């Protein structure tokens, strides 16, 4: 059925699974026209397809050309997402194919189920988790490859850098969701926390800074403080 707090460890078992988040597939700026109407301008988007056990991120860049002369783009974006996830599964060797695909938004269930009819043994599931994957585009290297794209492109990342050398996938996922939730809640404050200290850098081959274990504890506490601080600011609490 649906993935929730009851079945959290299931994310880190040895059954291959992918999260799919479609919140950055169709991205627009809204502006006034010369006649004072309103128009949208699409910008490049992405599908966020993540293996939470291994950190492998299949970032499918959605170039604005795919919207050209199309109607009902918010509807089409879900079907394009499902088409591309289906194409990714078919591209993978059998032993690498997921046994489950967890969609972050319930509106992705029918499109993905219909595109995956040829895979009746791959379960398509919603989640009751509120996951902050919309903030993927706050990770500078991911934003940069999406915006620079001139055509449809798939780029492969490990969203955990080398953390799994030191920590479990449960802990790595917890750290990722904390970082993304902080970036979602107050992007400028989170990037200051991560990038403030110039003596700690990001390796060419990494997304996040090269924190030692003790520095990660400090950063994680600063991220929790940020989220609390912002919840207090929001609710005047």
């Amino acid at each position: 059925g649906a993935m929730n707090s009851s079945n959290y460890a299931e994310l880190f078992n040895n059954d291959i699974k992918l999260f799919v988040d479609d919140t950055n597939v169709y991205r627009v700026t809204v502006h006034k026209t010369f006649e004072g109407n309103v128009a949208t301008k699409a910008i490049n988007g992405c599908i966020f397809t993540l293996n939470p056990k291994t950190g492998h991120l299949f970032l499918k860049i959605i170039h604005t050309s795919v919207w050209a002369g199309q109607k009902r783009l918010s509807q089409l974006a879900k079907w394009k997402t499902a088409e591309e996830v289906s194409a990714l599964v078919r591209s993978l060797p059998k032993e690498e194919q997921p046994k489950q695909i967890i969609v972050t938004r319930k509106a992705m269930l029918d499109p993905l189920e219909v595109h995956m009819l040829d895979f009746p043994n791959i379960a398509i599931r919603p989640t009751e988790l509120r996951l902050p994957f919309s903030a993927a585009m706050s990770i500078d290297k991911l934003s940069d490859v999406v915006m620079k794209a001139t055509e449809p492109q798939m780029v492969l990342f490990n969203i955990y850098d080398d953390w799994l050398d030191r920590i479990s996938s449960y802990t790595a996922f917890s750290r990722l969701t904390l970082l993304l939730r902080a970036l979602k809640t107050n992007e400028e404050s989170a990037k200051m926390i991560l990038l403030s200290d110039p003596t700690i850098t990001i390796k060419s081959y990494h997304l996040w800074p090269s924190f030692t274990d003790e520095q990660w504890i400090t950063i994680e506490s600063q991220m929790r403080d940020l989220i609390l601080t912002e919840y207090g600011r929001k609710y005047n609490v």
């Binding site: 509807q75 089409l76 079907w79 499902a82 088409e83 029918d110 499109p111 189920e113 219909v114 595109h115 009819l117 040829d118």
Partner: protein
């Protein structure tokens, strides 16, 4: 006008004949139904007074043979049987008619209700949905499952309705996923009409048969099939105009006949709201929309 004689009525029973129904008392001198209109299928149905579980009955056409009902005290139900001896059968019917031991099919001359509910229903198509080739009549009851329900278990006692499944490879052409899922025209016109039913009359016949089994037996699978066949047309952008106009007639008479107090169990809110107010055909079913809004405004 043909006749279905009864040997006797040893148990108290409500007897249906088409949209009519009569209560018979235990050992009442009841010997059947006369003046049955030739040219239509008919259904003769039963609900026992002492056990309202299993509604059951028989679809028949008096053009195909001489049928009678006999109670079986072993299996505990009224059974239809065929009499092959025409002269015996005529002699029994004459005796019961002269003794006025039969009720008369109570058709009002003005009243096209039964024709309107069975316009496309043929015995030969019933006998392919309900498989018992040794009889010319077809038994249906409240509990019989459909081939589709059995997939999701005695296959011989099943209703072989055509399987309709909007999230099936049959319904969705590889490469046309969004197209075929949001617009069911492919599935309706190529797969179902051209492919399986061959024409709109067969499709409407099965839809009308599903509705009647749902209404007369409370057969849940039949209700599912009726709504699936409505939704398949309503969810298709491209439907021949004659089919839309005919569907509106079909559904109008079905909604007109439905017992008001069964609307909560016989009508699917999601399907009807989708079909009347959201679908491609939301503006194609004027008569059905008007009767639904006047009779069942709470469902909508």
């Amino acid at each position: 006008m043909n006749t279905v004689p009864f040997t006797s009525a040893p148990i108290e029973v409500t007897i249906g004949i088409d949209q009519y129904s009569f209560n018979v008392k235990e050992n009442q001198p009841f010997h059947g139904i006369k003046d049955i209109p030739i040219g239509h299928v008919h259904v003769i149905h039963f609900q026992h007074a002492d056990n309202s579980s299993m509604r059951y009955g028989y679809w028949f056409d008096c053009r195909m043979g001489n049928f009678y009902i006999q109670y079986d005290p072993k299996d505990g139900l009224y059974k239809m049987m065929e009499e092959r001896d025409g002269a015996k059968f005529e002699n029994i019917v004459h005796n019961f008619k002269e003794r006025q031991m039969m009720v008369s099919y109570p058709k009002i001359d003005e009243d096209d209700t039964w024709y309107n509910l069975t316009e496309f229903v043929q015995m030969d198509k019933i006998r392919k949905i309900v498989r018992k080739d040794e009889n010319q009549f077809s038994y249906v009851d409240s509990s019989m499952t459909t081939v589709q329900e059995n997939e999701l278990s005695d296959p011989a006692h099943s209703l072989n309705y055509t399987v309709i499944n909007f999230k099936s490879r049959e319904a969705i052409r590889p490469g046309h996923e969004m197209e075929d899922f949001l617009d069911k025209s492919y599935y309706l016109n190529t797969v179902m009409l051209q492919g399986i039913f061959k024409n709109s009359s067969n499709y409407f016949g099965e839809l009308q048969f599903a509705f009647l089994n749902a209404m007369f037996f409370g057969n849940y699978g039949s209700s599912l099939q009726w709504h699936a066949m409505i939704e398949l047309i309503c969810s298709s952008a491209t439907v021949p105009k004659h089919m839309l106009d005919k569907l509106d007639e079909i559904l109008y008479y079905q909604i007109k006949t439905l017992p008001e107090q069964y609307s909560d169990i016989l009508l699917n809110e999601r399907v009807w709201n989708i079909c009347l107010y959201s679908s491609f055909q939301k503006n194609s079913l004027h008569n059905t929309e008007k009767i639904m809004e006047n009779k069942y405004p709470e469902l909508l």
